[model samples]
Target: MASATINLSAEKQVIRGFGGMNHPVWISDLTPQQRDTAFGNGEGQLGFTILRIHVDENRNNWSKEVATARRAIELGAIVSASPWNPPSNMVETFTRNGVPNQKRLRYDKYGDYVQHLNDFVAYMKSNGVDLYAISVQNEPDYAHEWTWWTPQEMLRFMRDYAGQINCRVMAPESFQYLKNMSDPILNDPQALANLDILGAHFYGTTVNNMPYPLFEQKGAGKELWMTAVYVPNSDSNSADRWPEALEVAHNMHNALVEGNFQAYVWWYIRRSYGPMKEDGTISKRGYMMAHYSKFVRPGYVRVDATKNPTYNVYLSACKNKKDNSVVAVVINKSTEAKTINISVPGTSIRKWERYVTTGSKNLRKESDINASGTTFQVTLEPQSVTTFV
Candidate 1:
């Protein structure tokens, strides 16, 4: 048995939301029913609160993509746009070893690239989809095929032209949270002022790489978010399996608890290993994400809770400041089932519903647990994640 305590008074970052990307090419793949399942907050849905769209420079017909984003926005999901590559004409190319490659954005075309992004946001707005945020470049540091931007280049554009755009601007979407890529923006007032959100991807990041002292010092009013994460190779062999989806749950726990990210976004919304399959059906990975996205909605504040009450048992708690309801997510990765003795202080939690995702379950509703006073004991199955609301 593991013992844990939840202190509602001890609060951490305010959670903005959780979601996955729906690139323009894949936007048309989802049917109307699939869209509802992906964005709907109703019963039997993932309840994603954020939507990421890829800004395609070559394609001008954004009606299909914009319509899908509008559907998500209508369902109360915030939309953000990121460009994989700038226009070819706006970038400089060079031949390396007889192979054509993109070096970086043309220095003189800096303002033009910004305008291209602005036009994308405007087009989405014209179709009734207001983007909540826009990123200058996605994974700028590791742009092998895409347009690359050095730290100095990124700072120059952000400090000079990012504010000229209409919507809020995000930058330095580093493939990893590299200090070289993020420090310049955090250290410079001009660059930091234009940056509304500090977005990074956790490709090879661990728990120790979560904290950013510089961002903490200078990013007082800015949002910190994990823009993309996925368990490599786990999807190919263990798609819709507990072994693979468990990693997703673990990453989400670390991103929120350790990284203190206000928002956590996945790479794709529909894939074999993603939350949903290409056939418009939910997968185990999707259920793993639902453990957080379904109940821990926007406006909820993550409160201090017991961390690793027992070996292989991870716990995170969030309080909905709106309705005074609380949600706690528990992940059990051990091979044996264990009983978790939990106590919530400072409020009366009489009755709570439990949702579990395991090898055989997909956010299945379990029998409700009635608390006596503020303490209750719940049995967590081996290799499972359970959410109590």
Candidate 2:
């Protein structure tokens, strides 16, 4: 048996919630039941609270996208729209290997690009989907197939045009949280003020790159969010691959513990490797996400906890200020099951419920554990994720 401790007095970042994106082309293809399974917070669903929508540059009619976003909003999800590319006409063109290439946004058309973003917000609102936030670009640094923005250009747009947009603005969604893309915004007072959320994607990032020391010092009002992450080739079709599901849980722990991100979002909501499969059923990856989203909800503050109580075991805790309920997520990444004793140092938990996602379980609710004074013991199955609340 191994011992883990939770210090409720020491709190960390406030969690914004978990979510995924809705592409217009795919969202329209989902049935009502599938949509509910993806966005609904009910039992046996993904229970996502944040919904990201793509602002299409090729089409002006956002009717289908708006309809999907409207439903997600009604289900208590915060909607954010991110653009993959600006209108083709507003970008600069170049030649690469005998083919036409449009890479960067024409610096002169910055104003027009801002207007296009504003129009997106207005259009979504007109259709009853009030966007909670909007981002300038999806991945400015790795835009080989999309529009790109240099660090200087990103700063210029944030300083001059981002503030003019009606909704909260996020920028420089770098593919790997590149300092070059976000440092300028954090350094420049004007650009920083205009930015409401510091967003990034985690494609090939390591734990060493997770901590943003500068953002900790200068990002007073802005939020830090991991906008997108996914394991390549980890399609839902490979449902029997439990190790891949465990990998996602491990990444979530790093994003919350090492990165101190307020929110963690996946790349897509529906696909072979998404939270939901093409058949509209929750995938193993979705169940892994549920270990957090279903219990440690919005407004829950991460409290200090023993990072690793024993070999191959990881822990992160959070408490709900509103209800005084505390949640601790434990992951056992070993070959043998281990008994874990969890203690709340300064407080007593009368009783807590546990839900687990293992090889045979998809967030199956287990029996409750009553605390012995301020401590309780539970056995964690090997290679499984369990959340106690």
Candidate 3:
């Protein structure tokens, strides 16, 4: 005979917090007024604690980046940026959308590219926005139709110039997390030595697709961050997958549990065609990100959570020191309503608060919520993500 009691009270996992929604497109398109509405007003409006930006490596608007970055800072959000490509002059090629052809930049010019990017970081700091971290290049191996950089070339560049950058450095932003693509970057001693942050995208990649062994092997040697990702396809024609809030929750839960990644960020927030539709409206998936970004905030540590197979429940628990409280984020990934039994040992879990991101037909709101003893049951709507704190 087997007993059905599982004591999760002894579990305590330090959460490094949750963040994303840097939205380079918004930085590239909107003005300061639009920026305030989109990223400013802090907590209630944008609802993000950390902001990720992309340098104008290809043909992005530098002024908008600075302006938007400044606004985000004004809202007290931490900012970081990654370059999608090196300066056209420094690189042999000029775009970042297609495969890297022979136009890949030569090895020597790599230093110049690093210097230029460092200069941009200095520029942002000069404008009162310090860049927390940067990537060698977005998807260096893919060599998109816009920019070109081979994995070897990226490794060479990192070996030669990564340490030179004053801020943190992320590298080999591979589109997919295949061992074949990442082993070169993760295995190289020189490249690994220079890396401060290891980043990868979740497009065309599953939970198992992430390179967890690399992080486990390195162990405190480097931090892992997902630079860009989103559900549902936009005009970009990437992945037209239908928008499902739980899908987003499921992907993130899978990432956190299986991949061991500390940071996660989505692509565009104001897009309608994709996760956020092309019309600059929020979609179900967009709301899903808000589920974490809005309540989890930043600087909160992730605690231990085990998902029960019977329900579509995904748990992300954190402790916010500033407020001196523990927050548990319950995300139901299935259509049926589910119950979560949270057990905290040594500390009494009190002062319960809740913020729900659900759609009437697909609408969301943050309202006062209450919960019961380390254990509680809530009705989760179909195809939606409800964040209970």
- Runs in model 2 deviating more than 4 A are 26-28, 95-100, 232-236
* Winning model by lDDT: 1
TM-score of each model, in listed order: 0.95, 0.95, 0.81
lDDT of every model, 2 decimals:
0.85, 0.84, 0.60
Q: Report residue 105 deviation for candidate 1 (angstroms).
A: 0.9
Local error of candidate 1 at residue 276 (angstroms): 0.7
lDDT of 3 by residue, 1-389 (tens): 11111233433334444445554553444445544544443443445555677787644466567766787678766777877656767656433444335356557787787787888888788888987787777776665444556666666767767888888887667777645555666787776788887777887777657646656776466777776776533345332234344577677776665676767777654454334444444455655655666666556666555544345556656666565466555665566665444545444444455556554543344554343554443455555565655
RMSD of each: 2.0, 1.9, 4.5
Candidate 1 residue spans exceeding 4 A from truth: 26-28, 94-100, 232-234
- What lDDT does candidate 2 reach at residue 281? 83
Return whichever of 1 and 3 wins on lDDT: 1
State the lDDT of candidate 1 residue by residue for 237-295, as single tens digits.
Answer: 35586566798889899988888899999887877767888777778888888899999
Clashes of each: 1, 2, 21
- The residue-by-residue lDDT of candidate 2 on 101-160, one tens digit each, is 657788889889889989888888888989889999999888778876879889999988
